[PDB]
Each structure stands twice: as structure tokens, then as C-alpha cells.
Amino acid sequence: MNYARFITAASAARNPSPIRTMTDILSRGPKSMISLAGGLPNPNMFPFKTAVITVENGKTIQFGEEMMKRALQYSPSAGIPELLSWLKQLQIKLHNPPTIHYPPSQGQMDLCVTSGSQQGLCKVFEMIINPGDNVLLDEPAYSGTLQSLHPLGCNIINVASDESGIVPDSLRDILSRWKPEDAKNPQKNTPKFLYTVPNGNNPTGNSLTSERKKEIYELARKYDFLIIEDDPYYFLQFNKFRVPTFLSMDVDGRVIRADSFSKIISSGLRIGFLTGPKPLIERVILHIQVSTLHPSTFNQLMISQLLHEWGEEGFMAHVDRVIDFYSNQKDAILAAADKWLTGLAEWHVPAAGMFLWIKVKGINDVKELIEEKAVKMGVLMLPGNAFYVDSSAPSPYLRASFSSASPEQMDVAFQVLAQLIKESL
């Protein structure tokens, strides 16, 4: 409602940047207009001329001469228009955000294609955080998010979490340190935002429930902080019905959502997108304008043509094939764990994503059990230390990936792990 509270002085100071009044006064004027004002290099010099890309369960994608010249040239900072338009309709279909027709100044929904979802997240953190600011999140958390927040000098306040994600009662108790009106008084530093991964948290695999999301949103309104919904496993949920998102209930315009195609379409193409209130999305776009400039035009056109041929039906059919694969992988790793973890460890069933979070019994720290003993036995799993702000503290947890391993490999790996646990007790 007052977005200036969430924008640093540096971010607010940004002004719009190049490739400007050249391809817009010419994108509506007469076809007889001569322009020597643009800053585009001549694309006829570029060496790639055509492309043919085959697609499984889809029409082959072809870039002819003219399309290739577009794919190899600069494009708009927020993304190419046909991809932005498709993605906007997808967000309306999946989330029907309340903010679609709000005035810009009070949070009109806006989208930005980013060079991966983490780029959007990083620029959002940089947009908001002054040194000393307080921010809320639940540990264990994605190590990359922790490493992104560390140099910004914010105080990370841990919110309790269990098998159903963030525990609202813990958030409420933490927030009771302040009065709601303190949010309009920056002297004692009410939290600027809550960050969470609401589906298939990396590393835990746990997901938030609908009732808790509603409680959390009410707290975000009461103490007027933003919700940063980092949802890269949104399309990798094993439940038949997806839990409503924070975006879908965001009547205030206080949610910034990051979506990713890295798990379902491609991680290497570096294409994700942000959805959020226009004043905040605009600050991110302005930062992109002086940084990457835009996501690869070529990769955007690959994805946009794929998605347009698929339609929303073909897209959802693809996600359902991917869910089917990962859910079978999940069943397989759970079977191996049931077989070989013998009351030697505890674990919750992942609700989404690609990781199993294992607590080993009777051992206080497992990085020595793995990085020393397990490595020479030919098995590797990741100690949980890296997913806490204080990574030097001992952790009895391991993160095991089921994205790729065959059932045989899982059986072997957990046999080895079981032996090591038993001979280490």
C-alpha cells in the first residue's frame, strides 16, 4: 500500500535505461519513417542463419531466416511480448490473482521474464534490504538464498517450521515483539518481508497447507510486510490438487512470486519469471536494464513457441508426465529407506520436489560420517549443515536426491549408509 517502505534509496534512484525511444516511435509510425536513432547492431552480420529443434510430444520448432535474425538481436528487458502474454494468462488461470485490474500504484499484477528465477529473487532482495533490516524465513532453507542474503547485512530471524511448513504460531510469537503501528515507524525495524518456499522446500521436501497460508497472509497484513513466494517446485507437487498460492489470495498487493521452468522445461536455458506489484516489479526491471539487459531472445522464442503450440492443455500434460516420473522416483527412494533405514533414521514423505530429508539417529554431526567414511565406500549424500544460517553448527541431517538414481543405485546407497551408521554408533 506504501511501496516506498520496501524500496532502498539506491533502488528508488534508478531511472529507465537504453534501447529506448527508437523501436517504439517506429513501432507505430508510418512504414516510410527513417530512423538513425537506434543502437542496434546489424543482425545480417551474425553467423547463425536457421535453426531446427525437435520436441518430444510436440511440433518441431523452426527458426527461419527472419525469425533467426530476431532471436539473435536485443529484445525488451521484461521479456518478449508473446511470452509475457502467455505467462500472464497462465498466472490468471492457475492463481486468478486479485490484483489483475488494480491501479498500478496499488499493486497491479505485473510480470518480468528473468534469466532464471534466482536472478529475479536476487534483485528483489537487493531492492528491499538495507543493512540491519530484519527479515523472516524458515530454516533449513536453500543454501543459495542464505548465501544471497548474507552479504546484504540483514538480520535473519528464523521462523519455526514442521512437516507442514512454517508454523503460524511461531511467526505470531516472533511478531509480538513489535506493535502493528511500528511498521509505519522505521526506527525499530519491523521485518520487511517473509521469504519461504511453500512447496517441496529444498532440502526438507515439506509443503505449506492452505489454512497456514491464510494465517500467514493475515499476519503479513497486520504487520505490513511483503511475502516473497519462491516457488520453483510449484509444478512438481505429488498431490492431485495444488494448494492455493499466496499470489492467489493477495488482495493487498504484497506478494512477490518467483516461478521457475528449471525443473520442468530447462535449467540451462536460464528462463524464469517474477509476478508481483507493478511498482516493485518496475524496480527489478530497471536493475535488469543495466545488468543482463534481457533474457536470451533465442531461448525465450524456443520456450514461447513450445508453449504456444502446447497450449495450456499441453503444458499441464507435460507437467503431469514430469510429476509422474518424480513421484515414482520418490516411491523408489522411500522403498529403499524403508528397507535399509531400520530405525537408524527418520524422514517425512516429500510432498513435492526432488529431495528426501533424512535425520540419522544417535549421531550429532553427519558431515564426518559422509565426507570421510561414505566417500570411500562409493556413496555420497549432502550434509544438512549448508542449509542453516549457522552452517558450522552440527547437523544430523542428510539431503538425498531422487531426481536421477535408479532403484538399484538407491538400494546400494542406503545399504552402505546403513552399515556406516551401525558401525559408527
Author numbering: 1 to 425
What does the report in the manuscript say about this coordinate set?
Our focus here is on KAT-II, which is a biologically active homodimer, and reportedly produces almost 75% of KYNA in human brain. The KATs irreversibly convert l-kynurenine (l-KYN), the main intermediate of the kynurenine pathway into KYNA, an endogenous neuroactive agent in CNS, as part of the main route of the tryptophan degradation pathway. KAT-II consists of 425 amino acid residues with its catalytic site at the homodimeric interface. PLP acts as a coenzyme and is covalently linked to Lys263 by a “Schiff base” reaction, resulting in an aldimine linkage.
In this paper the native structure of hKAT-II (PLP form) at 1.83 Å has been determined and refined, providing the highest resolution structure reported. The final model contains all the residues of a total of 425, containing the one modified residue, LLP (lysine-pyridoxal-5′-phosphate (LLP), which is substituted for Lys263), and 438 solvent molecules. The state in which the side chain amino group of Lys263 forms an aldimine bond with PLP, also referred to as the resting state is the state of the hKAT-II observed with no ambiguity in the electron density maps. Also the N-terminal arm is observed rolled into the location away from the active site, which does not otherwise affect the active site pocket. The oxygen of the pyridine ring hydroxyl moiety of LLP interacts with Asn202 and Tyr233, and the pyridine ring is also sitting parallel to and alongside the Tyr142 ring. Additionally, the pyridoxal ring of LLP has a hydrophobic interaction with Pro232, not previously reported in the other available aminotransferase structures. The biological dimer is observed faithfully in the crystal structure.
